[PDB]
Design an enzyme around this catalytic site. Structure first.
Site: not given
Ligand SMILES: [Fe+3]
Ligand SMILES: [Cl-]
Ligand SMILES: [Cl-]
Lengths: 285, 298
Positions: B64, B66, B92, B95-96, B124-125, B173, B221, B248
């Site tokens: 990832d 991110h 991924d 993100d933020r 998944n992002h 992922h 999750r 992940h």
């Molecule tokens: Fe993820």
């Protein structure tokens, strides 16, 4: 010592200490640090913007001094309630994105607020914003809201973002006469209705719902983007509803029953000759 | 690729690389069409390659990112900037943080410039909603408009889902799926598509391993499942594989083995969020199918 803009993005700082040295700071950036509480800021009385994006603040406090604050961002923290903002009367934008906020309160005194961002929270209803007359952008996506309602006062509102909620009916938009962008994707809406007064809409998104028929948008002659992928539309004649939109450029219709038609893209072009983008791809001539 | 395409591509990569070494926080403001073109062009390349990539060594596999754009830059310094090395990212990318646009634009640009030596899997992002992710959508509308995010979901919906390196290393992922019986089922997944909340494609982007679970268990999750060591072992024997390479999950040293080194988790974002103090790792595979792990630090 002499800067109007100060930036401590990604500086590991775990506590706000010794910022009195800044005389006329106007923008303070403290993103992606390690702050756990708000403190020691009462001296920076020249600030328009304060940025605490991505920290570990658990409560809003100690901000009452900075009344010239115009932009406040406490996103991606661990807030649970809204408070301690009632004194920042010149606030224009307020970001509280991705916290644990559950209720809209304590914003009644922010009459000049132009944008409110409460996305990715646990809010369940729209309340207590009748006083925000100058609101132009309201972001409530990714919440648990179940009905559109207390919006009747925001006559200047031009952008309403309500994606990823628990809505089941389009209603309560009668007064948003200047509404220009309406996002209601990923909800449980089954019928297009309640848009009788939103003539100035240029961007309408009701994708990822359970809508079977396009109706009641023949008056929306200013539409530029129509996002309706992932619904249950089956009749090509429904596209007659969009022929009044002579500047309609983009439509999303994929993963509807319509797309089973081997002439899907052809039929869209025939019905809506002004359209230049169908789903992701441009119309090629 | 046209020479006019190369001219604009190098202009974008240059302005993106120009903030390297700067004190983090500089963003680079590209034009809307530059970002949109990057989405459209890369999406066409994704559709022109299989959804189950079959890659050959050498290449460098990363976990990832991110949106941590300057940590992505540091990865390229260790592994070598393209085309000096071959890359397979496991998802991924956004993100933020307000630098996810730079991260994805640089990855998409290299994908266009080196389409058979640079590869991106779907995480998944990289979904098409804000049901569970808000940062990337938030950044797009704040710097540009919501339609830009919509265009990004069009690109995301066409990313590949898994990769098999030299017929021995399965890469995704999330992890394995109880619905996964044959590689053909992955090839049957059709694009564009969003990530469902249930099924083969969902588990490939969401599932985790667990020491406690013996077979399949539930995921804390709220989505997908958890699989144990036995699940891993039968899977490698049924498909004649040597290793599952996945991302992940945040791990302390950036890498972490599972089921007697039959699975490895990679995570390439050092000090994720901030409360953690993890490193980033990167697995490098050479021509003789040997795996070496390089570790990045804050
Ligand atoms: Fe993820
Ligand atoms: Cl197989
Ligand atoms: Cl495909």
């Amino acid at each position: 010592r002499d800067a109007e803009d100060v930036d401590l993005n990604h500086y590991r700082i775990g506590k706000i200490e010794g910022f009195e040295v800044l005389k006329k700071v106007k923008t303070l950036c403290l993103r992606q640090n390690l702050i756990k509480c708000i403190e020691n800021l009462e001296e920076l009385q020249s600030l328009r913007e304060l940025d605490l994006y991505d920290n570990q603040i658990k409560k809003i406090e100690n901000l009452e001094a900075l009344t010239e604050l115009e932009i406040l961002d406490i996103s991606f923290n661990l807030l649970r309630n809204i408070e301690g903002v009632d004194k920042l009367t010149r606030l224009k934008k307020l970001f509280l994105v991705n916290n644990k906020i559950s209720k809209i309160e304590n914003l009644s005194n922010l009459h000049q607020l132009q944008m409110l961002e409460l996305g990715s929270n646990r809010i369940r209803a729209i309340e207590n914003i009748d006083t925000l007359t100058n609101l132009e952008s309201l972001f409530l996506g990714k919440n648990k809201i179940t009905k559109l309602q207390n919006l009747d006062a925001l006559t200047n509102l031009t952008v309403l973002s309500m994606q990823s909620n628990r809505l089941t009916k389009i209603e309560g938009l009668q007064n948003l006469v200047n509404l220009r962008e309406l996002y209601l994707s990923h909800n449980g809406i089954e019928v297009i209705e309640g848009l009788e007064n939103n003539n100035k809409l240029t961007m309408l998104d009701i994708a990822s719902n359970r809508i079977k028929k396009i109706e009641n948008i023949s008056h929306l002659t200013e539409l530029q983007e129509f996002w309706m992928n992932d619904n249950l539309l089956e009749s090509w004649s429904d596209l007659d509803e969009l022929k009044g939109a002579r500047s309609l450029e983009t439509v999303y219709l994929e993963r509807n029953p319509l797309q089973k038609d081997p002439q899907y893209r052809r039929k869209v072009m025939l019905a809506l000759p002004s359209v230049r983008q169908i789903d992701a791809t441009f119309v090629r001539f | 690729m046209s020479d006019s395409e190369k001219l604009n591509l190098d202009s974008i990569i240059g302005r993106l690389l120009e903030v390297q070494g700067s004190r983090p926080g500089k963003n680079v403001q590209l034009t809307e069409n530059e970002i949109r073109g990057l989405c459209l062009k890369s999406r066409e390349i994704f559709l022109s390659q299989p959804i189950l990539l079959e890659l050959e060594a050498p290449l460098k596999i990363c976990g990832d990112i991110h949106g941590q754009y300057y940590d992505l830059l540091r990865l390229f310094e260790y592994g070598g900037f393209p085309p000096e090395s071959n890359y397979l990212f496991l998802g991924d990318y956004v993100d933020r943080g307000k630098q996810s646009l730079e991260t994805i634009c640089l990855l998409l640009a290299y994908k266009i410039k080196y389409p058979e030596n640079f590869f991106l899997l779907r995480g998944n992002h990289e979904c098409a909603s804000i049901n569970r992710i808000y940062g990337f959508y938030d950044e797009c509308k704040r710097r540009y408009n919501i339609k830009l995010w919509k265009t990004f979901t069009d690109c995301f919906n066409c990313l590949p889902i898994a990769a098999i390196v030299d017929e021995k290393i399965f890469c995704c992922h999330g992890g394995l799926s109880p619905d996964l019986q044959s590689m053909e089922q992955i090839r049957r997944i059709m694009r564009p598509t969003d990530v469902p909340d249930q099924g083969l494609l969902c588990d490939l982007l969401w599932s985790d391993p667990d020491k406690d679970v013996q077979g399949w268990g539930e995921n804390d999750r709220g989505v997908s499942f958890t699989f144990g060591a036995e699940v891993v072992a039968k899977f490698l024997h049924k498909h004649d594989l040597d290793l599952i390479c996945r991302a992940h999950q945040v791990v302390e040293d950036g890498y972490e083995f599972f089921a007697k080194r039959q699975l490895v988790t990679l995570f390439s974002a050092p000090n994720y969020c901030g409360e953690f103090d993890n490193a980033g790792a990167m697995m490098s595979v050479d021509e003789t199918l040997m795996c070496s792990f390089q570790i990045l630090k804050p």
